[PDB]
Design a protein around this ligand. Sequence first.
Ligand SMILES: O=C(O)CCC(=O)N[C@@H](C(=O)O)c1ccccc1
Ligand SMILES: O=C(O)CCC(=O)N[C@@H](C(=O)O)c1ccccc1
Ligand SMILES: O=C(O)CCC(=O)N[C@@H](C(=O)O)c1ccccc1
Ligand SMILES: O=C(O)CCC(=O)N[C@@H](C(=O)O)c1ccccc1
Ligand SMILES: O=C(O)CCC(=O)N[C@@H](C(=O)O)c1ccccc1
Ligand SMILES: O=C(O)CCC(=O)N[C@@H](C(=O)O)c1ccccc1
Lengths: 367, 367, 368, 367
Amino acid sequence: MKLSGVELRRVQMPLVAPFRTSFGTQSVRELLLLRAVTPAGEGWGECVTMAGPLYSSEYNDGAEHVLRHYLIPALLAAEDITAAKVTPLLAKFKGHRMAKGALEMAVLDAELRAHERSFAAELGSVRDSVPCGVSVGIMDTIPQLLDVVGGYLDEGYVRIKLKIEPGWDVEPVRAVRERFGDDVLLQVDANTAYTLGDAPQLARLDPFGLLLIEQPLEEEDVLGHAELARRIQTPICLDESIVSARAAADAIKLGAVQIVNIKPGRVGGYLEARRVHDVCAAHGIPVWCGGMIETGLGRAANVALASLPNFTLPGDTSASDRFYKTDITEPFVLSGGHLPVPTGPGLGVAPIPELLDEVTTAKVWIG
Amino acid sequence: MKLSGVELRRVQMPLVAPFRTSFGTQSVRELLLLRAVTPAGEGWGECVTMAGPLYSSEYNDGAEHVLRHYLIPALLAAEDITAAKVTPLLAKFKGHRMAKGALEMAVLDAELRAHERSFAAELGSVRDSVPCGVSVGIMDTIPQLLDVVGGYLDEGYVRIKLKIEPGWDVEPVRAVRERFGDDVLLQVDANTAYTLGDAPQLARLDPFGLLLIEQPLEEEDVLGHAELARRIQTPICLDESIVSARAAADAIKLGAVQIVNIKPGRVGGYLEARRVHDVCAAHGIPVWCGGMIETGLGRAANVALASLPNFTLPGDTSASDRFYKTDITEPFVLSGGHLPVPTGPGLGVAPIPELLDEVTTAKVWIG
Amino acid sequence: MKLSGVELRRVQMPLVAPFRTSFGTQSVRELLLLRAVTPAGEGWGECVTMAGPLYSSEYNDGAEHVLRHYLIPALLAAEDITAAKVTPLLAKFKGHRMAKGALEMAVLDAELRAHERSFAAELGSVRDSVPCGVSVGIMDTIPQLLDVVGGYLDEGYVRIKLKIEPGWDVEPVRAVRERFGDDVLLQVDANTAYTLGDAPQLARLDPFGLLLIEQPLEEEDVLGHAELARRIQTPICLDESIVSARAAADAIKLGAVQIVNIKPGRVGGYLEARRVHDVCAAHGIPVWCGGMIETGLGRAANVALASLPNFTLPGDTSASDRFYKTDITEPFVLSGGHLPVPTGPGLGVAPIPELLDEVTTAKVWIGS
Amino acid sequence: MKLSGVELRRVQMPLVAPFRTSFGTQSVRELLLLRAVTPAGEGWGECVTMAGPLYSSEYNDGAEHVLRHYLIPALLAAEDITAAKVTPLLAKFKGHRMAKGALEMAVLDAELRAHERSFAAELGSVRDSVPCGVSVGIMDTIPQLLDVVGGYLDEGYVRIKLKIEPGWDVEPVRAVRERFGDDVLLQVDANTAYTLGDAPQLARLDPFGLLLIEQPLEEEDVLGHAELARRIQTPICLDESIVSARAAADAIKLGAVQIVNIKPGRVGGYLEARRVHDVCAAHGIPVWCGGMIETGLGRAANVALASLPNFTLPGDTSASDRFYKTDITEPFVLSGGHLPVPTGPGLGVAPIPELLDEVTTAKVWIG
Ligand SMILES: O=C(O)CCC(=O)N[C@@H](C(=O)O)c1ccccc1
Ligand SMILES: O=C(O)CCC(=O)N[C@@H](C(=O)O)c1ccccc1
Ligand SMILES: O=C(O)CCC(=O)N[C@@H](C(=O)O)c1ccccc1
Ligand SMILES: O=C(O)CCC(=O)N[C@@H](C(=O)O)c1ccccc1
Ligand SMILES: O=C(O)CCC(=O)N[C@@H](C(=O)O)c1ccccc1
Ligand SMILES: O=C(O)CCC(=O)N[C@@H](C(=O)O)c1ccccc1
């Protein structure tokens, strides 16, 4: 293809209900969407950054600026463009994985739509639906939590993931296990809230049989997780630390992880995400798909990715309505705790202009 | 996709000159070809087995049999078929990687052709041509060899690989280094010729400065290799032992390999091959594409594969004329020592029937 | 004590000569400076980012935005501020080490001035002057390289570092060793230009007796460096990878590094920089001070830093004029191949108003 | 600054109640104080030695002697003295850390006061008050023990530390736990009283959930600690062994310690103490401030030190009265289980002459 230009768009989508992690509470979702334009057709990409750099150093304004000033321009300069070529084309620019992932996604959507191929096909999907878990936030009360959990449980959600923080760990856990039982698929997510010195507190979770504890320590603390792994029973799962397939291999070699959460944007794109998957598989490390409160746009692509062979645990691929009353694309609906893998070319989804325009705050053309 | 049937051909190409390995001399290459027939169109597969079981336990007739009786039927019995799904579908059958790979290859070719996608595209190529080296055999003499080598050098080949075996090691090497120089990309191939106890002998080449020594010991002797890596200077490269991406991870993790030779059929297909590439890449292990003296069909796929990012060493992607007087597809022509990546859909190449029929020794339709 | 605000200023300074590294060629320096205002007085910080994210993910516009919209506001919202408290106060924001380091730098300078203490004193200096090396970029020709190097050597620089990259490694090294001898302190810097697959080429540098080879591989590839180290004789030195004292400890443990290049901005500030020095020291790992073509402001803080006990190798603390014809503060002049550690309060230096104003491209006041 | 001279003063302070450890019983505290004099003003240093070489090889008379004849003389001989320079200036003298630490302290107090800077600012304090534990000696009776423990807990101490010794370990612990509950922060200290062979005995404490076991083995036995760590669940904490930042690094590397007690004099100074803290922090090793029964002078410096970021466990920084009915400075008074970090320049405290005079035994001036 020849890249004609990219339309960058800001979107704000209110949450159905505040979402609280160890890094804060969220009531609305500010996101960056990209529309790639080829003489041929368009492709959509979604950025996973939030407003401020709270999960990672990347943020909405930042991603926009880099895409705008550096990444888009570099691609426009390239004679012939391929989703695979994006990487090499943007290599001179250090970091900015989410931004890069979003652009590559857009490019890929367009490229595939053109070959009349689905994300699923390109990625190597082996199934037509995927089991979905849900990410439950930090509550104000336990009872509050319990209703919530129970709720999702009825919706048909397959696995329950609890955001934890110091002062919101063992109890909430103890509570769900007690009330909900021992056969619920249960795991926690610290979003880097702890330190090695908190091992004992976390060891206190040993007894509840969680599938895993996600990113207990800071992003950069790989060896620390390996140490931690040696002090707790709960399996370590890394998210933030997994910025690439190499990052994955290193962590695995170091004993710092047993399960990996794959978030495509975090790693710089769905192509790299695929690499992550294969690398983990090759080491006997199960993976699962992480979520960044995406629109049906990222949701679609993620569902496709989650259908890969090593995605052996339910991922954070909930239905549209878990967050949004109204999605910009046709909604994702939970059918028996699963989601259907899209069938059209590219993402298999596209925004409903009407809806999109309704949530668009800014727009800019880059050619 | 829906598999209509497979047609199996036996073909017999007459080698320009006999090619002597650590397992036996070669005058005519007997190959097994596959024509997968679908709704839409067809695809071609190429088996890398040989007449009999000397590089591996797989051979032309066993391959035919397994395919005919186990593999093909399994796919035929499927509803939707994708090259990715091939693996899962055949998983109950233990081993037979070359056979599976060939089958997968035929399917993929047909799938890509249907999406108007090239192999290269699908595989994530980023380069348009690839540097080619040549595999030099066991000579009966020195000058003989020194001549050939010198010969290949002339035509544009960028790297020289030298078949070795007890009694054909250090000397031959000594001679070429001597005669042709030191700034020549040179490396050897023992085809399991040695043993740990042979270490001291293989230590003998330290001096020369070879890019690597390939498969010095048995397929199964990984530890031996790592040990061996310990007792020599020349970087270990594995071929035979690398039967999969997991195999690679393991060998790497054990320090048994520094560079990996990728042979798509040996690992079960281009898809697994791509993963081997990705695995190696995540561990900083350079890869190069291994050759099985194929037609323009395996050659085209190899070339595409060889154009991936981590193929940082020239492959056994020698021109059509290196082995074959008359290929059954447009031939491959060196040019600046490179081979151009095929731009057409699927393999981007197809057999010229007369040519093909001239060589066919048998066929079978399987429906 | 309590932050009054911070002035963000953009500055553009022409290099006396274009500087080329594996990531490109620079003919001008675009910097971000900070003037922090406190009741006790003002302090100056210098950010080490460049125009685009080529050495790292951080860049001028990015740093300015984050400072402006997150970091400054956060310090302004505090009741009390100390350079030390800067880190915890800004910890909720991931990364942006360069930006944070510049901000902590400005606070620390104001703070130190208020106590009439110099950065050197604060950091634990033990020496009054420091041996200086020079960082030489990639040339068009060798002869060209040979001259430049010859000139520096003449100026009295104690060590030569050569920027390298694929296609500009062994030769240039050979050439210089050839021409200037084996007694000269010589080292190279790839700025991540290589990969593990390149070991053999790198192993070719073995014979030159280099002090070290700096950041051959990518920033995130620590294990590869440990592996590389096993493959080559030249000592590995890391720059880009060392983003903190913990990063240094980890690389050290993993045997990925033998010598550490310390860059205050890269690690998030002078305070963290001291910690890295200390951690290295505790592990028997020598350190040296890196440079980012700073104005006299960062140069001064660097000189102070580089006077610390474990900085046992000449650093990238060249005289002002190696890059700038006209520096914005009193210039740093080499004497006997050394630079004197500054003696006044804070940085011990300050910009000359007219000089600064002349290179200033933009300025903004960030107050509550 | 230039050092004019130093006044070395012997002081003896009676304890509110005798203090028994594995190396003995303390009824009266014999200290050494330093009053540094510089052209500008003075600074006070406190040495942690005791009368005899029972905790370490250093003792009051030895300290005074080395200071008089070697240390002080070396500082007087320098033209420019800075706290930082004390080290390099005293480097030729092997050992004598506590004595060097005392001198550094006095110099640093003068130096900081000159700049009107507190020890806390200099050290890098992040907090204004610190949570306090208390060290409880060996009792004759368990009941005597519970009484004492309940008293301290009643005063608001945040943590209980018990001196243990063969014949006084499990029982004492079992009892406090029984009596006071599982929620109390409880740890123990052997002051090197056991041997590797005593492992089964120590393992007997595992059930009790102690925070740590402090210095179970002899000072020089690092490897032994590493081994012991293997046989017991209680986390190992080192005191005696940690004579410096490098020692901490080494011990950490050898797996001999999980938590480090930092004692400024032990390591040769508050400056070195800061380095230890930093080294530990970089390795994820929590630290806490150790106590030596100091006067308000050392108490003051310790409280400032303990307010550093990686002091994430309560230290042996009890209220003045825990030992002394009448301290020589303004007293430290426990508040909400905490002590406030001093705000003045240097120590932020000074001796009350009148008081100081009463407890002074000897005094000399070194000029
Ligand atoms: O289900 C989802 O899409 C969100 C699940 C989730 O926990 N996402 C968290 C995360 O830290 O992983 C998140 C959301 C948005 C932005 C950053 C982080
Ligand atoms: O096919 C080529 O271009 C080179 C041939 C080659 O060296 N491969 C050899 C091998 O043993 O690796 C081979 C050829 C044919 C069959 C088996 C093996
Ligand atoms: O801060 C401002 O008010 C203007 C500067 C600004 O917007 N910086 C932007 C930009 O869009 O130009 C930016 C740069 C880098 C990162 C994020 C945003
Ligand atoms: O400042 C100096 O004296 C030499 C500067 C130097 O070599 N720094 C390079 C580097 O990669 O280390 C640099 C300068 C500016 C910005 C980034 C990097
Ligand atoms: O032993 C004696 O009583 C006479 C010598 C003596 O006091 N030794 C002193 C000293 O003060 O000179 C001393 C030396 C070494 C250690 C402690 C004290
Ligand atoms: O709280 C305090 O100040 C004393 C705590 C303590 O146990 N100190 C002991 C020790 O073994 O650490 C001690 C006191 C005085 C002298 C030596 C050792």
